[PDB]
Design a protein around this ligand. Structure first.
Ligand code: PC1
Ligand code: NDP
Lengths: 297, 110
Protein backbone atom coordinates (compact mmCIF):
# COMPACT_ATOMS: atom_id res chain seq x y z
CA UNK A 1 0.00 0.00 0.00
CA UNK A 2 1.47 3.31 -1.16
CA UNK A 3 2.56 5.93 1.36
CA UNK A 4 0.32 8.69 -0.01
CA UNK A 5 -2.79 6.50 0.33
CA UNK A 6 -2.25 5.55 3.99
CA UNK A 7 -5.02 7.14 6.09
CA UNK A 8 -4.11 10.01 8.40
CA UNK A 9 -5.85 12.50 10.62
CA UNK A 10 -9.02 12.24 12.67
CA UNK A 11 -11.38 11.66 9.75
CA UNK A 12 -12.25 15.32 9.20
CA UNK A 13 -12.08 17.64 6.21
CA UNK A 14 -8.29 18.04 6.06
CA UNK A 15 -7.69 14.37 6.88
CA UNK A 16 -6.58 11.59 4.55
CA UNK A 17 -8.87 8.59 4.18
CA UNK A 18 -6.92 6.70 1.54
CA UNK A 19 -10.02 6.57 -0.66
CA UNK A 20 -9.29 7.68 -4.21
CA UNK A 21 -12.80 7.54 -5.59
CA UNK A 22 -14.09 7.97 -9.12
CA UNK A 23 -17.81 8.64 -8.84
CA UNK A 24 -19.45 8.40 -12.26
CA UNK A 25 -22.67 10.35 -12.12
CA UNK A 26 -21.79 12.60 -9.18
CA UNK A 27 -23.81 15.47 -10.67
CA UNK A 28 -27.09 13.70 -9.85
CA UNK A 29 -28.95 12.85 -6.65
CA UNK A 30 -27.03 9.91 -5.19
CA UNK A 31 -23.71 11.43 -6.23
CA UNK A 32 -24.53 14.63 -4.35
CA UNK A 33 -24.68 12.94 -0.96
CA UNK A 34 -21.99 10.40 -1.90
CA UNK A 35 -19.44 13.11 -2.75
CA UNK A 36 -20.55 14.89 0.45
CA UNK A 37 -19.87 11.85 2.63
CA UNK A 38 -16.63 10.98 0.79
CA UNK A 39 -15.15 14.48 0.83
CA UNK A 40 -15.94 15.09 4.48
CA UNK A 41 -13.61 12.19 5.31
CA UNK A 42 -10.81 13.67 3.25
CA UNK A 43 -11.10 11.42 0.21
CA UNK A 44 -9.68 12.13 -3.23
CA UNK A 45 -12.94 12.29 -5.18
CA UNK A 46 -12.66 12.32 -8.96
CA UNK A 47 -15.85 13.68 -10.51
CA UNK A 48 -16.19 12.93 -14.23
CA UNK A 49 -18.91 15.27 -15.44
CA UNK A 50 -20.82 15.35 -18.71
CA UNK A 51 -22.85 18.50 -18.09
CA UNK A 52 -22.14 22.21 -17.82
CA UNK A 53 -19.49 22.99 -15.16
CA UNK A 54 -22.02 25.34 -13.51
CA UNK A 55 -24.13 22.29 -12.70
CA UNK A 56 -21.15 20.89 -10.72
CA UNK A 57 -20.75 23.94 -8.42
CA UNK A 58 -22.50 22.30 -5.44
CA UNK A 59 -19.85 19.58 -5.43
CA UNK A 60 -17.07 22.10 -4.76
CA UNK A 61 -17.52 22.94 -1.03
CA UNK A 62 -17.81 19.21 -0.26
CA UNK A 63 -14.11 18.67 0.41
CA UNK A 64 -10.70 20.17 1.08
CA UNK A 65 -8.54 21.88 -1.54
CA UNK A 66 -7.63 19.57 -4.39
CA UNK A 67 -9.74 16.73 -2.99
CA UNK A 68 -12.30 16.99 -5.80
CA UNK A 69 -10.90 16.69 -9.32
CA UNK A 70 -13.48 17.52 -11.98
CA UNK A 71 -12.88 16.20 -15.47
CA UNK A 72 -14.80 15.67 -18.69
CA UNK A 73 -15.92 12.25 -19.89
CA UNK A 74 -18.22 10.66 -22.43
CA UNK A 75 -20.20 7.45 -22.10
CA UNK A 76 -19.02 6.31 -25.53
CA UNK A 77 -15.36 7.29 -25.00
CA UNK A 78 -13.36 4.60 -23.21
CA UNK A 79 -10.28 6.84 -23.33
CA UNK A 80 -11.99 9.40 -21.09
CA UNK A 81 -13.05 6.63 -18.69
CA UNK A 82 -9.45 5.40 -18.51
CA UNK A 83 -8.29 8.99 -18.05
CA UNK A 84 -10.67 9.20 -15.08
CA UNK A 85 -10.05 5.83 -13.36
CA UNK A 86 -6.33 5.17 -13.86
CA UNK A 87 -5.40 6.54 -10.41
CA UNK A 88 -8.46 5.54 -8.38
CA UNK A 89 -8.62 2.76 -5.84
CA UNK A 90 -12.42 2.66 -5.97
CA UNK A 91 -14.86 3.33 -8.82
CA UNK A 92 -18.54 3.95 -8.06
CA UNK A 93 -21.09 3.97 -10.89
CA UNK A 94 -24.23 6.10 -10.56
CA UNK A 95 -25.20 6.77 -14.19
CA UNK A 96 -28.97 6.71 -14.63
CA UNK A 97 -31.93 8.26 -16.39
CA UNK A 98 -35.59 7.76 -15.54
CA UNK A 99 -36.39 8.66 -19.16
CA UNK A 100 -34.66 7.68 -22.38
CA UNK A 101 -33.39 10.50 -24.56
CA UNK A 102 -32.53 11.10 -28.20
CA UNK A 103 -28.86 10.13 -27.81
CA UNK A 104 -29.09 7.63 -24.93
CA UNK A 105 -31.69 4.94 -24.31
CA UNK A 106 -31.90 2.58 -21.33
CA UNK A 107 -29.63 0.16 -23.20
CA UNK A 108 -26.97 2.88 -23.45
CA UNK A 109 -27.28 4.14 -19.87
CA UNK A 110 -27.70 0.82 -18.05
CA UNK A 111 -25.89 -1.77 -20.22
CA UNK A 112 -23.26 -0.14 -22.43
CA UNK A 113 -21.91 2.57 -20.10
CA UNK A 114 -21.67 0.37 -16.93
CA UNK A 115 -19.99 -2.43 -18.89
CA UNK A 116 -17.58 0.11 -20.40
CA UNK A 117 -16.79 1.62 -16.98
CA UNK A 118 -16.35 -1.82 -15.41
CA UNK A 119 -14.23 -3.19 -18.27
CA UNK A 120 -11.92 -0.17 -18.30
CA UNK A 121 -11.75 -0.26 -14.49
CA UNK A 122 -10.79 -3.94 -14.66
CA UNK A 123 -8.06 -3.29 -17.23
CA UNK A 124 -6.76 -0.25 -15.29
CA UNK A 125 -6.16 -2.13 -12.04
CA UNK A 126 -8.90 -0.53 -9.93
CA UNK A 127 -9.27 -2.49 -6.69
CA UNK A 128 -12.93 -1.88 -5.87
CA UNK A 129 -15.95 -1.40 -8.11
CA UNK A 130 -19.46 -0.49 -6.98
CA UNK A 131 -22.50 -0.80 -9.23
CA UNK A 132 -25.95 0.54 -8.34
CA UNK A 133 -28.85 -1.49 -9.75
CA UNK A 134 -32.51 -1.37 -8.68
CA UNK A 135 -34.27 -3.78 -6.33
CA UNK A 136 -36.94 -4.75 -8.86
CA UNK A 137 -34.52 -5.50 -11.69
CA UNK A 138 -35.81 -8.46 -13.69
CA UNK A 139 -35.40 -9.80 -17.23
CA UNK A 140 -39.12 -10.60 -17.36
CA UNK A 141 -40.09 -7.26 -15.81
CA UNK A 142 -42.80 -5.10 -17.33
CA UNK A 143 -40.66 -1.96 -17.65
CA UNK A 144 -37.73 -1.41 -20.02
CA UNK A 145 -35.78 0.29 -17.19
CA UNK A 146 -35.64 -2.81 -15.00
CA UNK A 147 -35.01 -5.16 -17.95
CA UNK A 148 -31.96 -3.25 -19.16
CA UNK A 149 -30.81 -2.78 -15.58
CA UNK A 150 -30.91 -6.55 -15.00
CA UNK A 151 -28.94 -6.96 -18.24
CA UNK A 152 -26.37 -4.38 -17.16
CA UNK A 153 -26.09 -5.92 -13.70
CA UNK A 154 -25.35 -9.30 -15.30
CA UNK A 155 -22.71 -7.71 -17.55
CA UNK A 156 -21.06 -5.85 -14.63
CA UNK A 157 -21.03 -9.08 -12.61
CA UNK A 158 -19.41 -10.98 -15.48
CA UNK A 159 -16.77 -8.34 -16.32
CA UNK A 160 -15.84 -7.27 -12.77
CA UNK A 161 -16.24 -10.40 -10.62
CA UNK A 162 -15.69 -8.49 -7.36
CA UNK A 163 -18.19 -5.73 -8.11
CA UNK A 164 -20.27 -4.75 -5.11
CA UNK A 165 -23.71 -4.47 -6.72
CA UNK A 166 -26.30 -2.64 -4.62
CA UNK A 167 -30.11 -2.85 -4.91
CA UNK A 168 -31.89 0.20 -3.50
CA UNK A 169 -35.66 -0.10 -3.46
CA UNK A 170 -36.99 3.46 -3.90
CA UNK A 171 -34.65 6.16 -2.65
CA UNK A 172 -36.34 9.13 -1.00
CA UNK A 173 -34.67 12.35 0.03
CA UNK A 174 -34.69 16.05 -0.75
CA UNK A 175 -33.77 15.98 -4.46
CA UNK A 176 -35.48 12.63 -5.03
CA UNK A 177 -38.01 11.78 -7.72
CA UNK A 178 -40.05 9.53 -5.43
CA UNK A 179 -41.67 11.66 -2.73
CA UNK A 180 -41.33 14.79 -4.84
CA UNK A 181 -43.01 12.81 -7.61
CA UNK A 182 -45.95 11.94 -5.36
CA UNK A 183 -46.24 15.44 -3.91
CA UNK A 184 -46.37 16.96 -7.42
CA UNK A 185 -48.71 14.46 -9.08
CA UNK A 186 -51.84 15.95 -7.37
CA UNK A 187 -50.51 7.55 -10.15
CA UNK A 188 -53.20 5.65 -8.24
CA UNK A 189 -53.63 2.94 -5.61
CA UNK A 190 -53.28 -0.77 -6.34
CA UNK A 191 -51.89 -3.87 -4.60
CA UNK A 192 -48.34 -2.53 -5.03
CA UNK A 193 -46.15 -2.89 -1.92
CA UNK A 194 -43.09 -0.69 -1.40
CA UNK A 195 -40.41 -0.25 1.25
CA UNK A 196 -38.57 2.98 0.38
CA UNK A 197 -34.99 3.46 1.57
CA UNK A 198 -33.52 6.75 2.78
CA UNK A 199 -30.67 8.32 0.82
CA UNK A 200 -28.29 8.84 3.75
CA UNK A 201 -28.72 5.15 4.60
CA UNK A 202 -27.80 4.34 0.99
CA UNK A 203 -24.73 6.60 1.14
CA UNK A 204 -23.57 5.09 4.44
CA UNK A 205 -24.11 1.65 2.91
CA UNK A 206 -21.98 2.50 -0.12
CA UNK A 207 -19.16 3.90 1.99
CA UNK A 208 -19.28 1.00 4.44
CA UNK A 209 -19.15 -1.25 1.37
CA UNK A 210 -15.98 0.60 0.38
CA UNK A 211 -14.60 0.12 3.89
CA UNK A 212 -15.66 -3.52 4.31
CA UNK A 213 -13.25 -5.79 2.39
CA UNK A 214 -15.80 -8.62 2.67
CA UNK A 215 -18.29 -6.67 0.52
CA UNK A 216 -16.29 -7.55 -2.61
CA UNK A 217 -18.26 -9.81 -4.92
CA UNK A 218 -21.41 -9.41 -2.84
CA UNK A 219 -24.87 -8.16 -3.79
CA UNK A 220 -26.72 -5.92 -1.34
CA UNK A 221 -30.40 -4.95 -1.22
CA UNK A 222 -30.77 -1.54 0.43
CA UNK A 223 -34.36 -1.53 1.66
CA UNK A 224 -36.25 0.59 4.12
CA UNK A 225 -37.48 -0.71 7.46
CA UNK A 226 -41.22 -0.41 6.78
CA UNK A 227 -43.12 -1.94 3.88
CA UNK A 228 -46.05 0.16 2.68
CA UNK A 229 -48.81 -0.35 0.18
CA UNK A 230 -48.71 2.15 -2.66
CA UNK A 231 -52.07 3.76 -1.83
CA UNK A 232 -51.56 4.64 1.83
CA UNK A 233 -48.00 5.73 1.00
CA UNK A 234 -49.38 8.24 -1.52
CA UNK A 235 -52.04 9.27 1.00
CA UNK A 236 -49.31 9.82 3.60
CA UNK A 237 -47.41 11.98 1.10
CA UNK A 238 -50.51 14.08 0.49
CA UNK A 239 -51.13 14.18 4.25
CA UNK A 240 -47.67 15.56 5.09
CA UNK A 241 -47.60 18.00 2.15
CA UNK A 242 -51.01 19.43 3.26
CA UNK A 243 -52.83 18.59 0.04
CA UNK A 244 -56.41 17.33 -0.49
CA UNK A 245 -43.20 15.28 -16.71
CA UNK A 246 -44.10 11.59 -16.77
CA UNK A 247 -43.90 8.50 -18.95
CA UNK A 248 -45.49 5.06 -18.95
CA UNK A 249 -42.23 3.42 -17.82
CA UNK A 250 -42.49 5.36 -14.56
CA UNK A 251 -46.14 4.28 -14.37
CA UNK A 252 -45.05 0.65 -14.68
CA UNK A 253 -42.34 1.10 -12.05
CA UNK A 254 -44.56 2.84 -9.50
CA UNK A 255 -47.09 0.01 -9.85
CA UNK A 256 -44.26 -2.54 -9.61
CA UNK A 257 -44.03 -3.93 -6.09
CA UNK A 258 -40.73 -3.84 -4.21
CA UNK A 259 -39.72 -7.50 -4.12
CA UNK A 260 -38.29 -9.29 -1.09
CA UNK A 261 -34.82 -10.83 -1.48
CA UNK A 262 -33.90 -12.42 1.88
CA UNK A 263 -30.96 -14.30 0.35
CA UNK A 264 -29.23 -10.96 -0.29
CA UNK A 265 -27.85 -8.88 2.59
CA UNK A 266 -29.10 -5.37 3.19
CA UNK A 267 -28.20 -2.24 5.13
CA UNK A 268 -27.76 -4.03 8.46
CA UNK A 269 -24.92 -6.28 7.27
CA UNK A 270 -22.92 -3.14 6.42
CA UNK A 271 -23.63 -1.67 9.85
CA UNK A 272 -26.28 0.84 8.73
CA UNK A 273 -29.60 1.12 10.54
CA UNK A 274 -32.42 2.00 8.16
CA UNK A 275 -34.06 5.36 8.84
CA UNK A 276 -37.87 5.12 8.67
CA UNK A 277 -40.02 7.28 6.43
CA UNK A 278 -41.85 9.19 9.15
CA UNK A 279 -38.70 10.68 10.68
CA UNK A 280 -37.64 12.19 7.33
CA UNK A 281 -40.84 12.77 5.34
CA UNK A 282 -41.56 16.05 7.12
CA UNK A 283 -38.01 17.12 6.22
CA UNK A 284 -38.60 16.14 2.59
CA UNK A 285 -42.11 17.54 2.14
CA UNK A 286 -41.84 20.77 4.17
CA UNK A 287 -40.93 22.51 0.89
CA UNK A 288 -44.30 21.56 -0.64
CA UNK A 289 -46.44 23.23 2.03
CA UNK A 290 -47.93 26.59 1.06
CA UNK A 291 -50.11 13.70 10.72
CA UNK A 292 -51.18 10.10 11.25
CA UNK A 293 -48.49 7.65 10.02
CA UNK A 294 -49.04 5.28 7.13
CA UNK A 295 -50.13 1.69 7.64
CA UNK A 296 -47.36 -0.87 7.31
CA UNK A 297 -47.81 -4.49 6.23
CA UNK B 1 -66.23 51.57 -30.31
CA UNK B 2 -62.69 52.63 -31.10
CA UNK B 3 -62.18 53.13 -27.37
CA UNK B 4 -63.45 49.64 -26.51
CA UNK B 5 -61.13 48.17 -29.16
CA UNK B 6 -58.26 50.21 -27.70
CA UNK B 7 -58.97 49.03 -24.13
CA UNK B 8 -59.25 45.42 -25.30
CA UNK B 9 -55.97 45.75 -27.21
CA UNK B 10 -54.16 47.20 -24.19
CA UNK B 11 -55.56 44.52 -21.87
CA UNK B 12 -54.60 41.81 -24.38
CA UNK B 13 -51.05 43.16 -24.76
CA UNK B 14 -50.69 43.40 -20.97
CA UNK B 15 -52.02 39.86 -20.47
CA UNK B 16 -49.73 38.54 -23.22
CA UNK B 17 -46.68 40.17 -21.61
CA UNK B 18 -47.71 38.92 -18.16
CA UNK B 19 -48.18 35.39 -19.53
CA UNK B 20 -44.74 35.50 -21.17
CA UNK B 21 -43.25 36.77 -17.90
CA UNK B 22 -44.97 34.03 -15.86
CA UNK B 23 -44.43 31.11 -18.26
CA UNK B 24 -41.31 31.56 -20.42
CA UNK B 25 -38.83 31.15 -17.49
CA UNK B 26 -40.90 28.23 -16.15
CA UNK B 27 -39.44 26.12 -18.96
CA UNK B 28 -36.04 26.38 -17.25
CA UNK B 29 -35.33 23.00 -15.63
CA UNK B 30 -32.80 24.60 -13.25
CA UNK B 31 -33.16 22.95 -9.81
CA UNK B 32 -35.69 22.26 -7.09
CA UNK B 33 -35.04 24.82 -4.34
CA UNK B 34 -35.06 23.51 -0.78
CA UNK B 35 -36.74 25.76 1.83
CA UNK B 36 -37.82 28.77 -0.31
CA UNK B 37 -38.35 39.65 6.67
CA UNK B 38 -37.79 42.06 9.58
CA UNK B 39 -40.78 40.71 11.50
CA UNK B 40 -40.64 36.95 11.92
CA UNK B 41 -44.21 35.78 12.36
CA UNK B 42 -45.87 38.52 14.43
CA UNK B 43 -49.23 39.90 13.36
CA UNK B 44 -49.46 43.14 11.42
CA UNK B 45 -49.90 46.01 13.92
CA UNK B 46 -52.76 48.29 12.96
CA UNK B 47 -51.63 51.86 12.37
CA UNK B 48 -54.30 54.42 13.18
CA UNK B 49 -52.41 57.07 11.21
CA UNK B 50 -52.56 55.24 7.86
CA UNK B 51 -56.33 54.90 8.21
CA UNK B 52 -56.55 58.58 9.15
CA UNK B 53 -54.69 59.72 6.04
CA UNK B 54 -56.87 57.42 3.91
CA UNK B 55 -60.14 58.82 5.30
CA UNK B 56 -58.78 62.37 5.00
CA UNK B 57 -58.07 61.55 1.35
CA UNK B 58 -61.60 60.21 0.91
CA UNK B 59 -63.28 63.28 2.40
CA UNK B 60 -61.12 65.78 0.54
CA UNK B 61 -61.67 63.76 -2.64
CA UNK B 62 -65.41 64.18 -2.08
CA UNK B 63 -64.86 67.93 -1.78
CA UNK B 64 -62.86 67.66 -5.05
CA UNK B 65 -65.87 65.87 -6.58
CA UNK B 66 -67.93 68.91 -5.68
CA UNK B 67 -65.27 71.18 -7.21
CA UNK B 68 -65.02 69.31 -10.54
CA UNK B 69 -67.84 71.10 -12.49
CA UNK B 70 -66.17 74.54 -12.15
CA UNK B 71 -64.80 74.98 -15.75
CA UNK B 72 -68.40 74.46 -16.89
CA UNK B 73 -69.87 76.54 -14.06
CA UNK B 74 -67.88 79.63 -15.00
CA UNK B 75 -70.04 79.82 -18.17
CA UNK B 76 -73.24 80.65 -16.27
CA UNK B 77 -75.31 83.82 -16.32
CA UNK B 78 -75.74 83.87 -12.53
CA UNK B 79 -72.07 84.61 -11.92
CA UNK B 80 -72.33 86.31 -8.52
CA UNK B 81 -74.08 83.28 -7.02
CA UNK B 82 -71.70 80.91 -8.84
CA UNK B 83 -68.61 82.78 -7.63
CA UNK B 84 -69.94 82.89 -4.08
CA UNK B 85 -70.64 79.15 -4.01
CA UNK B 86 -67.31 78.26 -5.62
CA UNK B 87 -65.35 80.33 -3.11
CA UNK B 88 -67.54 78.84 -0.38
CA UNK B 89 -66.70 75.27 -1.44
CA UNK B 90 -62.96 75.94 -1.61
CA UNK B 91 -63.27 77.78 1.72
CA UNK B 92 -65.02 74.81 3.31
CA UNK B 93 -62.25 72.57 1.98
CA UNK B 94 -59.77 74.96 3.62
CA UNK B 95 -61.77 74.91 6.88
CA UNK B 96 -61.66 71.10 6.75
CA UNK B 97 -57.89 71.32 6.33
CA UNK B 98 -57.53 73.86 9.16
CA UNK B 99 -59.61 71.74 11.52
CA UNK B 100 -57.56 68.69 10.49
CA UNK B 101 -54.48 70.75 11.38
CA UNK B 102 -55.41 72.27 14.72
CA UNK B 103 -56.89 69.14 16.33
CA UNK B 104 -53.60 67.25 15.70
CA UNK B 105 -54.96 65.16 12.84
CA UNK B 106 -51.95 65.76 10.61
CA UNK B 107 -49.39 64.29 12.99
CA UNK B 108 -46.47 61.87 12.34
CA UNK B 109 -47.71 61.98 8.75
CA UNK B 110 -47.98 65.75 8.77
C1 PC1 C 1 -74.07 80.39 4.73
C2 PC1 C 1 -74.75 80.90 3.47
C3 PC1 C 1 -73.80 81.32 2.37
C4 PC1 C 1 -74.49 81.65 1.06
C5 PC1 C 1 -75.54 82.74 1.17
C6 PC1 C 1 -76.38 82.93 -0.07
C7 PC1 C 1 -75.56 83.28 -1.30
C8 PC1 C 1 -76.41 83.64 -2.49
O1 PC1 C 1 -76.05 84.33 -3.40
O2 PC1 C 1 -77.62 83.08 -2.41
C9 PC1 C 1 -78.52 83.31 -3.52
C10 PC1 C 1 -79.09 81.96 -3.92
C11 PC1 C 1 -79.73 81.95 -5.29
O3 PC1 C 1 -80.36 83.22 -5.54
P1 PC1 C 1 -80.16 83.90 -6.97
O4 PC1 C 1 -79.77 85.31 -6.76
O5 PC1 C 1 -79.28 83.02 -7.77
O6 PC1 C 1 -81.62 83.89 -7.60
C12 PC1 C 1 -81.87 84.11 -9.01
C13 PC1 C 1 -82.83 83.01 -9.38
N1 PC1 C 1 -82.23 81.77 -10.02
C14 PC1 C 1 -81.59 80.90 -8.99
C15 PC1 C 1 -83.31 80.99 -10.71
C16 PC1 C 1 -81.20 82.16 -11.03
O7 PC1 C 1 -79.92 81.31 -2.89
C17 PC1 C 1 -81.09 81.82 -2.45
O8 PC1 C 1 -81.59 82.84 -2.86
C18 PC1 C 1 -81.71 80.95 -1.40
C19 PC1 C 1 -80.81 79.83 -0.88
C20 PC1 C 1 -79.81 80.28 0.18
C21 PC1 C 1 -80.39 81.20 1.23
C22 PC1 C 1 -79.51 81.38 2.45
C23 PC1 C 1 -79.34 80.10 3.27
C24 PC1 C 1 -78.57 80.29 4.56
C25 PC1 C 1 -78.60 79.07 5.46
C26 PC1 C 1 -77.96 79.29 6.82
C27 PC1 C 1 -78.08 78.09 7.75
N1 NDP D 1 -34.64 6.78 -6.39
C1 NDP D 1 -33.42 6.70 -6.90
O1 NDP D 1 -32.72 7.70 -7.10
C2 NDP D 1 -32.89 5.37 -7.21
C3 NDP D 1 -31.89 5.27 -8.11
N2 NDP D 1 -31.33 4.08 -8.49
C4 NDP D 1 -30.25 4.04 -9.47
O2 NDP D 1 -29.15 4.73 -8.92
C5 NDP D 1 -28.44 5.43 -9.96
C6 NDP D 1 -28.27 6.88 -9.58
O3 NDP D 1 -29.56 7.45 -9.28
P1 NDP D 1 -29.92 8.98 -9.35
O4 NDP D 1 -28.88 9.84 -8.78
O5 NDP D 1 -31.19 9.16 -8.57
O6 NDP D 1 -30.20 9.43 -10.85
P2 NDP D 1 -29.87 10.80 -11.59
O7 NDP D 1 -30.60 10.88 -12.87
O8 NDP D 1 -30.31 11.93 -10.69
O9 NDP D 1 -28.29 10.88 -11.73
C7 NDP D 1 -27.67 10.19 -12.82
C8 NDP D 1 -26.28 10.72 -13.02
O10 NDP D 1 -25.70 10.11 -14.19
C9 NDP D 1 -25.44 11.10 -15.17
N3 NDP D 1 -25.88 10.59 -16.46
C10 NDP D 1 -27.15 10.24 -16.82
N4 NDP D 1 -27.26 9.81 -18.05
C11 NDP D 1 -25.97 9.88 -18.54
C12 NDP D 1 -25.40 9.57 -19.79
N5 NDP D 1 -26.11 9.09 -20.81
N6 NDP D 1 -24.08 9.75 -19.95
C13 NDP D 1 -23.37 10.23 -18.92
N7 NDP D 1 -23.79 10.56 -17.70
C14 NDP D 1 -25.10 10.36 -17.57
C15 NDP D 1 -26.17 12.36 -14.73
O11 NDP D 1 -25.40 13.51 -15.14
P3 NDP D 1 -25.97 14.80 -15.88
O12 NDP D 1 -26.51 15.75 -14.89
O13 NDP D 1 -24.82 15.35 -16.68
O14 NDP D 1 -27.01 14.29 -16.85
C16 NDP D 1 -26.18 12.22 -13.22
O15 NDP D 1 -24.96 12.72 -12.67
C17 NDP D 1 -29.19 5.16 -11.26
O16 NDP D 1 -28.57 4.12 -12.00
C18 NDP D 1 -30.58 4.74 -10.78
O17 NDP D 1 -31.20 3.84 -11.68
C19 NDP D 1 -31.80 2.93 -7.93
C20 NDP D 1 -32.77 2.91 -7.04
C21 NDP D 1 -33.45 4.14 -6.57
Amino acid sequence: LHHAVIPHGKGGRSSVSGIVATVFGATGFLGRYLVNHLGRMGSQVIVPYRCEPYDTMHLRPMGDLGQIIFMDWNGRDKDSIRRAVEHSNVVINLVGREWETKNFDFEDVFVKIPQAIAQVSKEAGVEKFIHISHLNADIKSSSKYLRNKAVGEKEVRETFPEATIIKPADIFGREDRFLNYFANIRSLGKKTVKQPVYIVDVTKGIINAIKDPDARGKTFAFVGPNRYLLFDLVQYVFAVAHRPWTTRDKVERIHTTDRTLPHLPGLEDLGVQATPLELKAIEVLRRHRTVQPAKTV
Amino acid sequence: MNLMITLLTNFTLATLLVTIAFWLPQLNVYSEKTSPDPMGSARLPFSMKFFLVAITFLLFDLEIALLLPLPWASQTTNLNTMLTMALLLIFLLAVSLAYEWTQKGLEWTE
